[PDB]
C-alpha cells in the first residue's frame, strides 16, 4: 500500500474522474482507505459511476 503503484493509481484515478461529483469521489476514497484490499473494486465502481454520468 505504502506508495504502491496500484494503490496510488487507484486513489489518483478516483480523483481524476470529471463526471463524479465531490460527494461521490470522496465516498469512494473513504471506501478505498477502509478497504485497501478492495482497491480494484472501488476503482471499478468509481469508473462505472463516472462512465454512467458521462454527458455523451
Curated annotation (Swiss-Prot):
Q: What does this protein do?
A: Plays a role in the inhibition of the host innate and adaptive immune responses. Possesses five immunoglobulin-binding domains that capture both the fragment crystallizable region (Fc region) and the Fab region (part of Ig that identifies antigen) of immunoglobulins. In turn, Staphylococcus aureus is protected from phagocytic killing via inhibition of Ig Fc region. In addition, the host elicited B-cell response is prevented due to a decrease of antibody-secreting cell proliferation that enter the bone marrow, thereby decreasing long-term antibody production.
Q: What's in the domain note?
A: Each of the immunoglobulin-binding region repeats can bind the Fc region of an immunoglobulin.
From the UniProt record, report the name of the gene that encodes this protein.
spa
Q: Where are the Immunoglobulin-binding region E repeats?
A: 1-56
User: What do we know about how this protein assembles, alone or with others?
Assistant: Interacts with host TNFRSF1A; this interaction leads to the stimulation of both surface expression and shedding of TNFRSF1A.
Biotechnology usage: Important immunodiagnostic reagent because of its ability to bind the Fab and Fc fragments of a wide range of mammalian immunoglobulins.
Q: What is this protein called?
A: Immunoglobulin G-binding protein A
Subcellular localization: Secreted, Cell wall
Family that this chain belongs to: Belongs to the immunoglobulin-binding protein SpA family.
